[PDB]
Design a protein around this ligand. Structure first.
Ligand SMILES: [Mg+2]
Lengths: 388, 181, 380
RNA sequence: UCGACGUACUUCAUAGGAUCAUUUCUAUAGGAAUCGUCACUCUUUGACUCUUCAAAAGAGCCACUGAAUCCAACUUGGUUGAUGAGUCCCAUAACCUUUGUACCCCAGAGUGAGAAA
RNA sequence: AUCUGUUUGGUGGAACCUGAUUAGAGGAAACUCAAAGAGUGCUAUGGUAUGGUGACGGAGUGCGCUGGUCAAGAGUGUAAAAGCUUUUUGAACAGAGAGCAUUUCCGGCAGCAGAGAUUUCAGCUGUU
């Protein structure tokens, strides 16, 4: 006695009409089970009458939640109202086949004139619609059911888990992996800048050993021939004259062995020196972000040892959750290759590692960690330090 | 024909387009293959000769066992068939019925005897050498591969004198004497 | 096979054509040969909607040829027999088969509805309704269908009640489409204006409802726009939430502005009363953003409409100095509450509006109001 | 040499259940098959051409008319480079040694209730 | 080394024995030509086949059908009720196209004006 069928897709709600009723007494016979697999046989059983796609990703999640809770959404109420004919509440009722029994009482409340069925006969039809999928929709735009399932699946799962970007600690791992890379590249490129300008003015590389200062100076003194008293003051403003380099360069540029390189070559040196300048500034900007992120993600661990050292420790474990799950001994050897925590010296290191382990646990398993426990835990280490 | 479904096979049990009872199991084709018989009706000419022997043996068997006529004639038939090579042994009279077959006669054809004498690697190769005039029985060249060789005449099957095959045999062992050729 | 059954259904017609003398047997043979090709095309695998379109066009040409031989040979407009309605019946059946096979193709649905509407006498309107009932169920989210049947029943038939229920039901499926809101309000204002023009007609021979739709339109459209651009999740960042709130305000402001333009057409309605409601709506704070502080540019336009509201529709001939004095009086009041940069922009726009609408259309020598307007423009 | 007796030794049965055999039905209702074809992938077999082990025989001779290969000759390119020849296991590299710089000399899936007096 | 002679790897494959096969065993080529097997793809959809033989269709009337509201009736229950069942009837209202009749009009011909791109439809008057 099934006349209509409700099927819930990730894309929307589909309503079918049952053209023929399959045999119920012989439901378990093989030939009635095979017709569900065969599309030629199945298409004679049901036909699509309506389809109402969701507006977007947001609506899909809301109706996924409502269907999970056995509730009738406004969208579901609209499609059913448009399709199901009006019948008597008592004399005779339009029959609707639904997959979930919990959804029956909800639909009955909204539509008193529809009787819901979810017996094994109904399930067999629902199984067939799921089996053949988009083939039954006669080309109607159902998107791609497999792809939307992936998006909706992650959305539904995280919403129950209440997953947040705040719990994210991989930003720390990215920052540390990038920060040391910048420290390598800044040095490697800065060394090259010393060589290239070394050809044009080799002694100056000796005058200003600090590479970052050398790059800024080279950006100013592009050609050692150009030497003015005002220029001396301007480069004297660069850094300080305490080292006396301002006088040395002017006297030394006058008498030097550097062979003049072409204008195009100088253009590369200044631009490449300009490049070393940008990464240095970006590195400092990223370093502050790592410090800020550490406080938010792991205030206890950052406060106890430090933001950078904590960031290195999290990366070594591979994640904050991995660090927490480790025993105290494993945490100690986790930082024993770079000496992160470093006979009496070892005793502090072993003592400090245990506290760091507990600090990680507070951070990892707290939705909004505080630094209150980090402060006292660090204080306990300080007393241990003074004692030893 | 395509493989018959279940309900079709039940209603078409006796349908066979490739094997019939009158074929007798394609025994003729099988035997023609084993001994490389090129004439389609050579088997059935042999079969009629085998039937004649089997008819006589049956009639003799129905004569009383101690009959001198019965014993004489059965021995003559056993003597003649053994001499031809059709029968391997002369001991038992039941061989006239059980062991008289077309395969026995085909086994005395010239290609097969060449094969057993190792003059050819296969019966097919022996047929080709006969058809190409390399083979002589006695002083007579034979290009008919159906020639039936008796036991006595199997001693005179040999290569033709100027055969290229004969030179290869002697050249291989470094025993070629060009005076002979 | 299905093809043979359909070909045999043609035989009673083709026999009638021969009997009436319109077609010869050889010509009848050629027509059936072409139909045999098409029926096979439709009943086979790989059929496409183009096969249905071709077979419908072919049958149409046969009908035209039959009609012309009817006048040429029989010399009658109609021969009372099957051949009159056989082709028209057949064409409708090809449309049913095509739509069932390929419900996705909206072009074919439009052709089916146009064909049946054109022969109104042959096809009862109830059959038109069945097509729209079936089409609407298959594509509830295509607002064009909802407007189409809403339009069809309001012009051909003029069922405001059923045309209303279409808009009520259409908005139930597609509350996030501003176009359907715009058309629904357009119908209501048409219904009122037709009613008032009907009222005007009786006398010689003897708008709030739209605004409610506008108000719910503003509420509903904003809700869906937030649901979009957020994806599955809410936006944790406080700043990005405020940006999303601005987008809705700018989005809703543009949609509300279109309604302001829509009111302009309806002369019969007290549009100034209709406009003032829209302005009163934007005075209220929405989504914890005040128009004056966060989006001054929108607020300046709102003040602009309010200042010119009383004089917007006053023709140059009927220009009243008192209303201008009320208009300018509104202008100074807003200045005292506006920043210098905002005042400069409003001052420039107000000058331009007065200059283009009135000053350039006023004769300088004949109208004393020209000097007053020029003095006002100079002082502004 | 045969008998009888005694002794020793060899051999012989029979059951329960299912399936296949009737151009439906092998006797049982506990079992399972009734559709006028349109494509694509894969697999098996056989022809045709050529060929190896691996050879053997040429329906045979003349004439005309095409084709292919190898030499000679000539023409182009060629020591200012013809021919032959593993980029594809980073010679844009790996490994070893020396030097310089910064750190390290306790257990490791570490142990698990002592310590101080 | 006119030393030694075992092992490892390659070449080779007598005899005996065992197994399989046999018009001997193979190889290469393909937008070639055949005969078959398996799996997969495709709306692959008449549970009784278009609204229609002037044997007709459209418009409208009536009957019929549907929904709930109200009123009354019957039953049950009560001290009296309230409450519940009703294949009991009626009223107005809201409808479906989903059946049955209906000749009441229209679909022959001419004229008026209107909507859309010479053609399509709607209306009005005369006429068969
Ligand atoms: Mg037995």
């Amino acid at each position: 006695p099934i006349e209509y069928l409700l099927f819930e897709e990730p894309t929307g709600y589909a309503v079918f009409k049952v053209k023929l009723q399959q045999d119920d007494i012989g439901s378990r016979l093989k030939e009635v089970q095979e017709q569900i697999n065969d599309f030629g046989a199945f298409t004679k059983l049901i036909e699509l009458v309506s389809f109402a796609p969701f507006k977007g990703a947001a609506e899909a999640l809301e109706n996924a939640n409502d269907i999970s809770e056995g509730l009738v959404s406004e969208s579901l109420k609209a499609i059913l109202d448009l399709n199901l004919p009006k019948a008597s509440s008592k004399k005779k009722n339009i029959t609707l086949a639904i997959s979930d029994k919990n959804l029956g009482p909800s639909i009955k409340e909204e539509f008193p004139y529809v009787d819901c069925i979810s017996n094994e006969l109904a399930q067999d039809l629902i199984r067939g619609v799921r089996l053949h999928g988009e083939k039954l929709f006669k080309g109607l735009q159902s998107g791609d059911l497999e792809r939307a399932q992936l998006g909706l699946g992650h959305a539904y799962s995280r919403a129950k888990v209440k997953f947040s970007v705040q719990k994210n600690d991989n930003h720390i791992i990215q920052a540390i992996a990038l920060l040391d890379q910048l420290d390598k590249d800044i040095n490697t490129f800065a060394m090259r800048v010393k060589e290239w300008y070394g050809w044009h003015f080799p002694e100056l590389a000796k005058l200003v050993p600090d590479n970052y200062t050398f790059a800024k100076l080279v950006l100013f003194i592009k050609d050692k021939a150009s030497l003015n008293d005002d220029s001396l003051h301007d480069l004297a403003a660069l850094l300080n004259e305490d080292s006396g380099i301002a006088q040395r360069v002017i006297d030394n540029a006058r008498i030097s062995m550097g062979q003049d390189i072409s204008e195009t070559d100088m253009e590369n040196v200044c631009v490449f020196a300009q490049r070393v300048a940008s990464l240095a500034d970006y590195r400092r900007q990223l370093y502050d972000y790592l410090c800020e992120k550490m406080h938010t993600v792991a205030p206890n661990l950052s406060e106890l040892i430090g933001e950078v050292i904590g960031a290195r420790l999290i990366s070594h474990a591979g994640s904050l959750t991995n660090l927490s799950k480790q025993a105290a001994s494993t945490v100690q050897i986790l930082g024993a290759e770079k000496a992160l925590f470093r006979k009496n010296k070892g005793r502090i290191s072993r003592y400090l590692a245990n506290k760091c382990s507990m600090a990680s646990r507070i951070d990892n398993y707290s939705e909004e960690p505080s630094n209150v426990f980090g402060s006292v835990l660090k204080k306990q280490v300080e007393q241990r330090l003074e004692f030893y | 024909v395509r493989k018959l479904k279940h309900h079709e096979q039940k209603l078409l049990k006796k349908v066979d387009f490739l094997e019939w009872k009158q074929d007798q199991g394609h025994r003729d084709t099988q035997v023609m293959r084993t001994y490389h018989i090129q004439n389609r009706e050579d088997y059935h000419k042999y079969n009629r000769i085998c039937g004649d022997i089997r008819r006589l043996a049956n009639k003799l068997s129905l004569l009383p066992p101690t009959d001198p006529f019965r014993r004489k004639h059965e021995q003559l038939l056993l003597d003649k068939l053994y001499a031809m090579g059709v029968l391997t042994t002369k001991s038992k009279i039941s061989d006239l019925e059980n062991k008289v077959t077309v395969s026995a006669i085909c086994r005395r054809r010239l290609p097969v005897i060449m094969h057993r004498l190792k003059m050819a690697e296969t019966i097919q190769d022996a047929v080709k050498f006969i058809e190409q005039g390399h083979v002589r029985v006695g002083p007579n060249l034979i290009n008919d591969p159906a020639y039936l060789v008796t036991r006595n005449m199997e001693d005179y099957v040999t290569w033709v004198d100027n055969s290229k095959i004969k030179k290869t045999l002697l050249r291989y062992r470094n025993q070629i004497d060009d005076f002979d050729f | 096979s299905k093809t043979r059954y359909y070909l045999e259904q043609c035989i009673p017609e083709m026999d009638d054509l021969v009997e009436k003398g319109l077609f010869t047997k050889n010509e009848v043979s050629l027509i059936m040969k072409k139909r045999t090709d098409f029926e096979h095309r439709l009943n086979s695998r790989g059929s496409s909607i183009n096969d249905y379109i071709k077979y419908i066009n072919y049958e149409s040409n046969v009908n035209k040829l039959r009609a012309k031989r009817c006048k040429r040979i029989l010399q009658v407009k109609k021969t009372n027999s099957l051949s009159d309605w056989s082709i028209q019946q057949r064409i409708g059946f090809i449309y049913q088969r095509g739509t069932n096979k390929f419900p996705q193709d909206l072009k074919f649905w439009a052709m089916y509805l146009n064909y049946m509407k054109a022969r109104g006498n042959q096809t009862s309107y109830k059959k038109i309704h069945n097509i729209y009932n079936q089409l609407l169920k298959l594509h509830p989210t295509n607002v064009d269908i909802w407007i189409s049947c809403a339009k069809y029943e309001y012009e051909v038939h003029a069922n405001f009640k059923s045309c209303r229920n279409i808009f009520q039901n259409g908005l139930r499926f597609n509350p996030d489409v501003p176009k359907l809101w715009y058309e629904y309000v357009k119908f209501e204002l048409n219904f009122i204006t037709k009613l008032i023009n009907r009222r005007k007609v009786m006398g010689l021979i003897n708008g709030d409802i739209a605004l409610t739709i506008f108000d719910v339109c503003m509420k509903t459209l904003g809700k869906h726009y937030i649901n979009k651009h957020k994806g599955y999740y809410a936006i944790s960042d406080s700043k990005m939430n405020i940006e999303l709130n601005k987008e809705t305000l700018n989005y809703l402001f543009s949609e509300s502005l279109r309604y302001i333009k829509l009111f302009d057409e309806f002369l019969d309605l007290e549009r100034d009363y209709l406009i003032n409601h829209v302005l009163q709506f934007w005075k209220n704070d929405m989504y914890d953003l005040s128009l004056r502080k966060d989006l001054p540019e929108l607020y300046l336009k709102t003040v602009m409409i309010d200042i010119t509201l009383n004089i917007r529709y006053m023709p140059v001939e009927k220009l009243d100095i008192d209303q201008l004095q009320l208009s300018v009086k509104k202008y100074f009041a807003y200045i005292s509450k506006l920043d210098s940069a905002s005042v400069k922009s409003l001052k420039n726009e107000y000058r331009s509006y007065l200059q283009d609408n009135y000053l350039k259309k006023m004769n300088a020598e004949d109208d004393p109001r020209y000097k007053i307007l020029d003095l006002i423009i100079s002082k502004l």
